[PDB]
XYZ file of C-alpha atoms in Angstrom:
613
model
C -16.237 -23.266 33.722
C -12.908 -22.370 32.001
C -10.476 -24.675 30.198
C -6.874 -25.812 30.776
C -6.584 -26.475 27.010
C -2.847 -25.526 26.995
C -2.221 -29.114 28.172
C -3.902 -30.371 24.964
C -2.106 -27.722 22.854
C 1.378 -28.305 24.343
C 1.152 -32.095 23.854
C -0.132 -31.622 20.260
C 2.297 -28.813 19.449
C 5.146 -31.202 18.696
C 3.776 -34.523 19.959
C 0.755 -36.597 20.901
C -3.035 -36.268 20.761
C -3.823 -38.201 24.007
C -4.566 -35.165 26.217
C -6.621 -33.658 23.360
C -8.556 -36.935 22.763
C -9.202 -37.101 26.523
C -10.252 -33.475 26.920
C -12.243 -32.794 23.698
C -15.639 -33.662 25.223
C -14.982 -31.006 27.897
C -13.803 -28.588 25.145
C -16.821 -29.041 22.736
C -18.226 -25.556 23.543
C -14.804 -23.876 23.945
C -14.381 -21.612 20.833
C -10.633 -22.421 20.174
C -11.298 -26.200 20.156
C -11.087 -26.126 16.293
C -7.360 -25.000 16.497
C -6.468 -28.322 18.245
C -8.561 -30.485 15.823
C -6.844 -28.638 12.947
C -3.355 -29.343 14.342
C -4.346 -32.950 15.226
C -5.547 -33.615 11.651
C -2.579 -31.732 10.109
C -0.012 -34.030 11.870
C -1.660 -37.201 10.462
C -2.822 -35.534 7.231
C -1.048 -38.021 4.921
C -2.958 -41.069 6.284
C -6.336 -39.255 6.687
C -9.263 -40.112 4.390
C -10.828 -37.742 1.870
C -14.183 -37.949 3.702
C -12.643 -36.891 7.059
C -10.789 -33.944 5.506
C -13.813 -32.875 3.362
C -16.011 -33.029 6.490
C -13.445 -30.864 8.343
C -13.419 -28.272 5.538
C -17.247 -28.124 5.572
C -17.378 -27.717 9.371
C -14.399 -25.299 9.712
C -14.030 -23.386 6.407
C -14.236 -20.140 8.433
C -10.876 -20.828 10.222
C -8.078 -18.372 9.171
C -5.580 -21.184 8.538
C -7.888 -23.371 6.378
C -5.991 -22.245 3.234
C -2.808 -23.936 4.469
C -4.706 -27.213 5.016
C -6.004 -26.999 1.420
C -2.467 -26.328 0.100
C -0.974 -29.247 2.068
C -3.922 -31.508 1.170
C -4.209 -30.677 -2.570
C -0.483 -31.425 -3.041
C -1.184 -34.979 -1.885
C -4.279 -35.222 -4.086
C -2.038 -34.449 -7.112
C 0.849 -36.805 -6.154
C -1.827 -39.506 -5.800
C -3.392 -38.507 -9.170
C -6.783 -38.162 -7.410
C -7.774 -35.271 -9.666
C -11.552 -35.735 -9.244
C -11.105 -34.570 -5.642
C -8.461 -31.923 -6.461
C -10.766 -29.956 -8.764
C -13.643 -29.988 -6.240
C -11.446 -28.049 -3.755
C -9.025 -26.028 -5.938
C -9.610 -22.299 -5.406
C -7.770 -19.552 -7.361
C -8.795 -17.120 -4.553
C -6.196 -18.850 -2.295
C -3.434 -17.307 -4.464
C -1.097 -20.283 -4.212
C 0.919 -20.427 -7.441
C 1.701 -24.091 -6.636
C -2.004 -25.015 -6.760
C -2.506 -22.923 -9.933
C 0.355 -24.774 -11.659
C -1.079 -28.129 -10.529
C -4.490 -27.058 -11.886
C -2.674 -26.242 -15.153
C -1.327 -29.798 -15.282
C -4.887 -31.072 -14.663
C -6.321 -28.956 -17.504
C -3.781 -30.298 -20.034
C -4.112 -33.914 -18.858
C -7.937 -33.912 -19.076
C -8.818 -32.331 -22.450
C -8.865 -28.609 -21.480
C -5.957 -27.673 -23.786
C -6.852 -24.067 -24.692
C -7.657 -23.382 -21.046
C -4.382 -25.083 -19.987
C -2.327 -22.970 -22.428
C -3.915 -19.770 -21.106
C -3.161 -20.909 -17.533
C 0.454 -21.754 -18.397
C 1.003 -18.480 -20.307
C -0.416 -16.430 -17.414
C 1.893 -18.205 -14.915
C 4.829 -18.003 -17.394
C 4.579 -14.255 -18.149
C 5.815 -13.285 -14.682
C 9.224 -11.644 -14.078
C 10.060 -13.704 -10.972
C 10.916 -17.368 -10.497
C 7.901 -19.669 -10.000
C 7.420 -22.872 -7.863
C 8.907 -26.292 -8.789
C 5.358 -27.457 -9.646
C 5.374 -24.844 -12.464
C 8.484 -26.278 -14.181
C 6.426 -29.469 -14.561
C 3.627 -27.434 -16.210
C 5.971 -25.230 -18.253
C 7.603 -28.425 -19.599
C 4.252 -29.887 -20.717
C 3.296 -26.522 -22.225
C 6.679 -26.322 -24.039
C 6.351 -29.999 -25.052
C 3.090 -29.197 -26.856
C 5.132 -26.590 -28.783
C 3.540 -23.483 -27.224
C 6.684 -21.941 -25.663
C 7.685 -19.860 -28.729
C 10.643 -17.468 -28.811
C 8.295 -14.451 -28.489
C 6.987 -15.871 -25.183
C 10.432 -16.464 -23.656
C 11.515 -13.007 -24.911
C 8.517 -11.386 -23.203
C 9.401 -13.052 -19.845
C 13.065 -11.966 -20.127
C 11.765 -8.395 -20.497
C 9.602 -8.787 -17.366
C 12.518 -10.266 -15.379
C 14.823 -7.406 -16.401
C 11.990 -5.091 -15.246
C 11.807 -6.975 -11.913
C 15.625 -6.780 -11.599
C 15.793 -10.604 -11.224
C 18.912 -10.924 -13.368
C 19.718 -14.593 -12.617
C 16.320 -15.488 -14.098
C 16.741 -12.888 -16.879
C 20.125 -14.390 -17.857
C 18.822 -17.990 -17.688
C 16.118 -16.902 -20.162
C 18.786 -15.286 -22.412
C 20.499 -18.716 -22.831
C 17.145 -20.181 -24.015
C 16.733 -17.851 -27.026
C 17.828 -19.575 -30.262
C 17.776 -16.633 -32.713
C 17.746 -13.650 -30.280
C 20.548 -14.448 -27.757
C 22.539 -11.318 -28.760
C 19.770 -8.851 -27.866
C 18.900 -10.915 -24.772
C 22.418 -10.439 -23.372
C 22.178 -6.768 -24.382
C 18.913 -6.466 -22.409
C 20.511 -7.796 -19.195
C 23.505 -5.429 -19.686
C 21.290 -2.405 -20.433
C 18.915 -3.203 -17.523
C 21.881 -3.166 -15.104
C 23.472 0.004 -16.518
C 21.160 1.893 -18.914
C 23.630 4.788 -19.506
C 25.398 2.492 -22.020
C 22.731 3.739 -24.464
C 25.045 6.793 -24.921
C 26.929 4.455 -27.309
C 24.296 4.869 -30.013
C 26.370 2.913 -32.570
C 26.169 -0.201 -30.353
C 22.297 -0.031 -30.209
C 21.295 0.928 -33.784
C 20.447 -2.544 -35.239
C 16.972 -1.807 -36.660
C 14.732 -4.692 -35.434
C 11.860 -4.878 -32.911
C 14.047 -6.850 -30.409
C 16.668 -4.065 -30.189
C 13.816 -1.555 -29.703
C 12.603 -3.557 -26.677
C 16.122 -3.462 -25.118
C 16.553 0.268 -25.832
C 12.991 1.036 -24.635
C 13.586 -0.651 -21.290
C 16.940 1.145 -21.048
C 15.482 4.620 -21.617
C 12.711 4.069 -19.037
C 15.169 2.904 -16.387
C 17.618 5.685 -17.354
C 14.800 8.239 -16.932
C 14.446 7.544 -13.181
C 18.162 8.246 -12.416
C 19.205 10.636 -15.230
C 16.176 12.074 -17.122
C 18.301 14.660 -18.969
C 20.467 12.034 -20.725
C 17.392 10.012 -21.754
C 15.788 13.176 -23.173
C 18.753 13.724 -25.498
C 18.815 10.071 -26.533
C 15.040 9.852 -27.233
C 15.334 12.117 -30.278
C 17.935 9.872 -31.884
C 16.504 6.450 -30.951
C 12.926 7.043 -32.211
C 14.265 7.653 -35.779
C 16.882 4.877 -35.531
C 14.599 2.016 -34.425
C 11.107 0.582 -35.095
C 9.350 1.536 -31.842
C 5.609 0.873 -31.968
C 3.351 3.865 -31.287
C 2.559 2.828 -27.701
C 6.201 1.800 -27.035
C 7.189 5.484 -27.589
C 4.527 6.950 -25.264
C 5.626 4.550 -22.493
C 9.207 5.908 -22.892
C 8.045 9.549 -23.149
C 5.938 9.030 -20.008
C 8.871 7.971 -17.795
C 11.149 10.742 -19.088
C 8.433 13.410 -18.664
C 7.384 12.244 -15.187
C 10.994 12.192 -14.025
C 11.723 15.667 -15.481
C 8.524 17.085 -13.941
C 9.527 15.919 -10.442
C 12.834 17.790 -10.910
C 10.666 20.796 -11.995
C 12.317 20.931 -15.415
C 9.952 22.719 -17.859
C 11.267 20.599 -20.785
C 8.774 18.001 -19.515
C 5.907 20.238 -20.737
C 6.272 19.914 -24.552
C 7.065 16.192 -24.260
C 4.040 15.436 -22.042
C 1.864 17.669 -24.291
C 2.884 15.854 -27.528
C 2.813 12.223 -26.303
C -0.454 12.441 -24.329
C -2.602 15.313 -25.701
C -5.855 13.445 -24.912
C -5.018 13.339 -21.166
C -5.383 9.549 -21.127
C -2.752 8.908 -18.453
C -3.936 10.428 -15.184
C -0.435 10.480 -13.639
C 0.994 12.410 -16.610
C -1.958 14.838 -16.369
C -1.574 15.357 -12.604
C 2.184 15.988 -12.886
C 1.748 18.188 -15.953
C -0.591 20.314 -13.762
C 1.715 20.061 -10.683
C 4.680 21.323 -12.724
C 2.769 24.387 -13.985
C 1.792 25.216 -10.352
C 5.497 25.006 -9.412
C 6.507 27.299 -12.306
C 3.826 29.861 -11.356
C 2.010 29.455 -14.683
C -1.510 29.673 -13.237
C -3.292 30.660 -16.477
C -2.078 27.347 -18.002
C -2.758 25.419 -14.790
C -6.370 26.639 -14.697
C -6.898 25.836 -18.413
C -5.768 22.286 -17.687
C -8.111 21.789 -14.690
C -11.097 22.440 -17.002
C -9.951 19.727 -19.442
C -9.571 16.906 -16.886
C -11.301 13.509 -17.182
C -14.404 12.889 -15.038
C -12.595 10.823 -12.343
C -9.917 13.538 -11.764
C -12.342 16.496 -11.901
C -14.519 14.547 -9.396
C -11.831 14.597 -6.690
C -11.385 17.335 -4.126
C -7.756 17.852 -5.210
C -8.544 19.199 -8.675
C -11.721 20.966 -7.604
C -9.468 22.861 -5.164
C -6.688 23.593 -7.676
C -9.238 24.622 -10.332
C -10.566 27.281 -7.946
C -7.142 28.205 -6.569
C -5.344 28.413 -9.947
C -8.208 30.625 -11.141
C -7.848 32.752 -7.967
C -4.097 33.125 -8.698
C -4.647 33.694 -12.454
C -7.551 36.165 -11.943
C -7.387 37.762 -8.455
C -10.495 39.919 -9.080
C -12.757 37.052 -10.282
C -15.659 35.758 -8.147
C -15.883 32.218 -9.607
C -13.361 30.901 -7.006
C -15.646 31.693 -4.025
C -18.479 29.593 -5.550
C -16.019 26.724 -6.224
C -14.523 26.860 -2.688
C -18.061 26.859 -1.199
C -18.859 23.359 -2.558
C -15.607 22.098 -1.142
C -15.363 23.726 2.327
C -18.179 21.367 3.372
C -15.919 18.301 2.932
C -13.910 16.920 5.893
C -10.750 16.505 3.853
C -7.302 18.119 3.387
C -8.554 19.980 0.305
C -11.867 20.686 2.060
C -9.910 22.235 4.945
C -7.946 24.403 2.457
C -11.084 25.626 0.649
C -12.552 26.529 4.057
C -9.325 28.295 5.013
C -9.405 30.334 1.769
C -12.945 31.526 2.585
C -11.773 32.196 6.196
C -14.634 30.020 7.552
C -14.633 27.186 10.147
C -13.876 23.575 9.197
C -16.788 21.107 9.127
C -15.726 17.914 10.944
C -19.265 16.523 11.269
C -18.832 13.766 13.859
C -21.959 11.732 13.035
C -21.632 8.277 14.705
C -23.068 5.328 12.753
C -26.620 4.018 13.266
C -26.494 0.272 14.048
C -29.213 -2.391 14.165
C -29.052 -4.374 17.477
C -29.741 -7.678 15.626
C -26.716 -7.042 13.363
C -24.495 -6.243 16.379
C -25.744 -9.404 18.145
C -25.223 -11.595 15.039
C -21.623 -10.294 14.695
C -20.876 -10.707 18.456
C -22.325 -14.261 18.529
C -20.486 -15.316 15.313
C -17.829 -18.000 15.930
C -14.911 -16.109 14.340
C -15.694 -13.161 16.648
C -16.040 -15.344 19.796
C -12.688 -16.999 18.973
C -10.975 -13.598 18.607
C -12.535 -12.383 21.887
C -11.071 -15.453 23.611
C -7.592 -14.854 22.130
C -7.710 -11.219 23.348
C -8.609 -12.246 26.917
C -5.861 -14.941 26.848
C -3.323 -12.255 25.837
C -2.594 -13.408 22.271
C -2.844 -10.071 20.445
C -1.842 -11.535 17.101
C -4.173 -14.557 17.000
C -7.139 -12.371 17.996
C -6.173 -9.809 15.359
C -5.883 -12.476 12.618
C -9.373 -13.831 13.419
C -10.723 -10.272 13.071
C -9.195 -9.516 9.638
C -10.133 -12.870 8.093
C -13.758 -12.729 9.368
C -14.206 -9.214 7.935
C -12.831 -10.277 4.502
C -16.466 -11.381 3.682
C -18.635 -9.264 6.119
C -20.973 -6.739 4.420
C -20.996 -2.973 5.219
C -23.424 -3.169 8.178
C -21.547 -6.168 9.581
C -18.230 -4.271 9.290
C -19.452 -1.216 11.262
C -20.788 -3.583 13.947
C -17.328 -5.185 14.014
C -15.803 -1.699 14.381
C -18.014 -0.661 17.306
C -17.389 -3.888 19.269
C -13.590 -3.429 19.019
C -13.820 0.256 20.048
C -15.723 -0.745 23.214
C -12.831 -3.133 24.108
C -10.335 -0.203 23.733
C -8.721 -2.120 20.883
C -8.200 0.827 18.600
C -6.411 -0.374 15.443
C -8.931 -3.140 14.515
C -11.748 -0.641 15.141
C -10.017 1.858 12.831
C -9.344 -0.930 10.310
C -12.875 -2.376 10.304
C -14.620 1.032 9.992
C -12.289 1.939 7.076
C -13.192 -1.159 5.001
C -16.840 -0.157 5.672
C -15.983 3.374 4.455
C -18.099 4.997 7.178
C -15.947 8.102 7.446
C -18.034 10.363 9.737
C -17.586 8.304 12.964
C -14.648 10.375 14.281
C -14.761 8.813 17.777
C -13.738 5.410 16.399
C -11.434 6.749 13.637
C -9.412 9.132 15.863
C -9.237 7.788 19.422
C -7.067 9.218 22.217
C -4.991 5.993 22.414
C -1.931 6.561 24.652
C -3.175 10.061 25.600
C -1.228 10.503 28.854
C 2.010 9.319 27.196
C 1.480 11.362 24.012
C 0.646 14.636 25.767
C 3.563 14.179 28.216
C 6.251 13.655 25.541
C 4.872 16.549 23.428
C 5.219 19.023 26.321
C 8.822 17.831 26.897
C 9.909 18.987 23.414
C 7.701 22.087 22.810
C 5.515 20.454 20.155
C 1.714 20.703 20.004
C -0.171 17.689 21.409
C -2.349 17.460 18.261
C 0.666 17.212 15.958
C 2.039 14.075 17.730
C -1.450 12.478 17.882
C -1.685 13.052 14.116
C 1.737 11.527 13.385
C 1.221 8.284 15.374
C -2.322 7.944 13.971
C -0.955 8.334 10.437
C 2.113 6.109 10.932
C 0.581 3.135 12.884
C -3.155 3.777 13.485
C -2.237 2.806 17.094
C -0.971 -0.725 16.260
C 1.912 -0.738 18.760
C 3.749 -3.703 17.124
C 3.619 -2.412 13.512
C 6.307 -3.114 10.915
C 6.699 -1.541 7.444
C 8.071 -3.059 4.211
C 11.642 -2.232 5.338
C 11.362 -2.471 9.127
C 10.102 0.855 10.477
C 8.770 -0.221 13.873
C 6.073 0.744 16.398
C 3.501 3.495 17.064
C 5.648 6.209 15.404
C 7.341 3.880 12.845
C 10.950 4.441 13.936
C 13.703 3.216 11.675
C 16.295 0.988 13.393
C 19.122 3.308 12.216
C 17.234 6.446 13.357
C 16.022 4.826 16.618
C 19.556 3.756 17.578
C 20.915 7.264 16.737
C 18.190 9.085 18.713
C 18.813 6.735 21.663
C 22.493 7.746 21.923
C 21.938 11.460 21.158
C 18.920 12.332 23.381
C 20.043 9.998 26.228
C 16.931 7.799 25.967
C 17.664 4.116 26.769
C 17.012 1.487 24.050
C 17.644 -2.268 24.482
C 16.941 -3.662 21.002
C 15.385 -2.908 17.586
C 12.642 -5.259 18.893
C 11.990 -3.043 22.018
C 10.246 -0.431 19.782
C 6.953 -2.336 20.443
C 6.802 -0.865 23.983
C 4.600 2.262 23.561
C 6.533 4.477 26.042
C 9.886 3.565 24.401
C 8.455 4.259 20.912
C 6.755 7.566 21.831
C 9.839 8.858 23.740
C 12.405 8.638 20.946
C 9.776 9.186 18.249
C 8.867 12.597 19.715
C 12.615 13.237 20.132
C 13.322 12.811 16.412
C 10.222 14.880 15.628
C 11.452 17.872 17.728
C 14.915 17.409 16.183
C 13.401 17.894 12.670
C 10.918 20.506 13.984
C 13.954 22.600 14.998
C 15.803 21.856 11.746
C 13.093 23.744 9.781
C 12.397 26.688 12.150
C 9.316 24.981 13.599
C 7.531 24.523 10.249
C 5.205 21.507 10.765
C 4.695 21.099 6.987
C 8.417 20.773 6.265
C 9.189 18.961 9.555
C 6.409 16.443 8.856
C 7.838 15.620 5.413
C 11.363 15.439 6.912
C 10.121 12.871 9.431
C 8.797 10.522 6.717
C 11.247 11.208 3.849
C 14.491 12.364 5.553
C 15.662 16.014 5.952
C 17.972 15.831 2.916
C 15.022 15.102 0.594
C 13.049 18.028 2.038
C 16.125 20.220 1.473
C 16.238 18.854 -2.107
C 12.547 19.692 -2.627
C 13.221 23.234 -1.338
C 16.039 23.862 -3.811
C 16.011 27.178 -5.697
C 12.740 28.484 -4.227
C 11.523 31.998 -3.449
C 8.218 32.839 -1.682
C 6.770 29.385 -2.473
C 3.282 28.822 -1.070
C 2.739 25.849 1.278
C -0.189 24.268 -0.641
C 1.812 24.344 -3.902
C 4.838 22.847 -2.165
C 2.800 20.026 -0.624
C 1.172 19.341 -3.998
C 4.523 19.127 -5.805
C 6.273 16.658 -3.454
C 7.944 14.050 -5.779
C 7.047 11.038 -3.596
C 3.403 9.872 -3.614
C 3.816 8.295 -0.132
C 5.243 11.435 1.478
C 2.675 13.747 -0.126
C -0.343 11.807 1.195
C 1.447 11.457 4.527
C 1.795 15.269 4.895
C -1.812 15.927 3.801
C -2.971 13.319 6.371
C -0.864 14.594 9.329
C -1.998 18.187 8.890
C -5.631 17.059 8.474
C -5.461 14.716 11.472
C -3.873 17.504 13.530
C -6.942 19.662 12.800
C -9.213 16.809 13.975
C -7.123 16.002 17.072
C -6.934 19.764 17.830
C -10.723 19.913 18.287
C -10.672 16.707 20.360
C -7.979 18.102 22.732
C -9.880 21.439 22.849
C -6.771 23.198 21.516
C -7.972 24.364 18.033
C -5.374 23.925 15.271
C -5.793 25.639 11.883
C -4.675 23.584 8.861
C -1.434 25.637 8.707
C 0.027 28.251 11.041
C 0.716 31.830 9.830
C 4.492 31.322 9.623
C 4.108 28.081 7.598
C 2.276 29.624 4.611
C 5.345 30.717 2.582
C 8.916 29.355 2.512
C 12.139 29.125 0.475
C 15.861 28.175 0.646
C 16.639 31.827 -0.155
């Protein structure tokens, strides 16, 4: 039959187990029955026996919420001093700092001193505030005389780095000999430009060097030119260790290179000649490409480490820099011919340089029926299926993620294909990605919200494929998505932008929370897109970047240009997030172009060169 288990849930959920105790024998085969049992045990967890709880963990360890039960339970096992049990069930994989600090207490109180010190030190050297259970441990660690001044100093430095200045100041009051430099470190961390007063920061010890070194690295991100001047002076004045200088030189050079200041070049060259830091090497190469120094850029691409030379990026720029440096040479055609085979942004470029068609290569994955069956029959799967039919998107989704956290590659692809056949596109995308089966382009790029997406594209004179690419890149079709700072829905609209586009384009919006509705999200997403499309004379490359990073940043990154090529511009975008985003949207728009039978080249003719000139 089918189960009225909401009676048992509603009574449990704030209340009594009587309807659950009545109904359980009916519910034995019902897959969500272990959510009620969980809740029922959790309410009376304090009075429950070890043996009942242990038995529950053995029978339902697969449940997504089992970690919370272990956190709640292991607290009690420590307050009771029942450490024999605690250590049988303590799991560092749960990533609960409370349980790690309690395990630290255990280690110290049961002969594992060295191990307990290491545990304490690892939980201490963290620039944020830790749980109340860790003050207990930190006290015992201190009380065995391990909390030296060097260890408190090192945490202060990490807390100034984290910008947790209440913590950083608290730690400054706990330095006996070094309280002067500690207060200096909190002052410098908050305003690093104070390092202009070189007389005030010339006391020649290793503690002052730490405070100045932090200051210069933070100063580099806002004002690299001031830090450059001050580096010269401070490296004579103070006892910076060898690696403390290269860390400072790194931040200054990286910051200067993203402003396209060539004074980054000699600094980067001197402080990392071995090309140890990949980021320094990439930006050293990116800067040369921006300055039009292709001979140098090519030279550099030969010298790269294995893991950078491996990638399609630097295979492409090796060929392309050589093509720019030596227009008559025939090495570039051989190098592009490896790469045009790849279904990739840089593979699409290499193809486009040869003037040959892109190789998408939609090869769907070969699945064993026994593996598909095993995955479909699995309890975690059957529970998720049930949540989806009931109309709990989020519960079903959670079951899916947590199950896949320990499924092998075959099992993951099976999980992908089952979710695709339910027209549940984001989990299918997600599952196939953790498998890293890239060639199944049916599952990876579905036509999710086709009718709506094509309609709103035609309204604003934008290509269908470009909007499909954006929403695929921004949400992967998860219609209730939410970023770190609250960009919402299929096209990741910002509350401020959403509200502004609602008033301007006459599209009705109820709430910030109404951005979950696909038609609402697509309407005033495609509106903003056409607004920035128009702002940059219909240049998808620029317009794309403007969408993700804000038109004023794109204008910034176009400053003082003249006949700048599109591939160079994309490569030298200062933000890592925005650069990948642009490379993805253009690539996805190629793929969606084929799938809409409206072929899209990687870039249009009028997008290939641009300036603010």
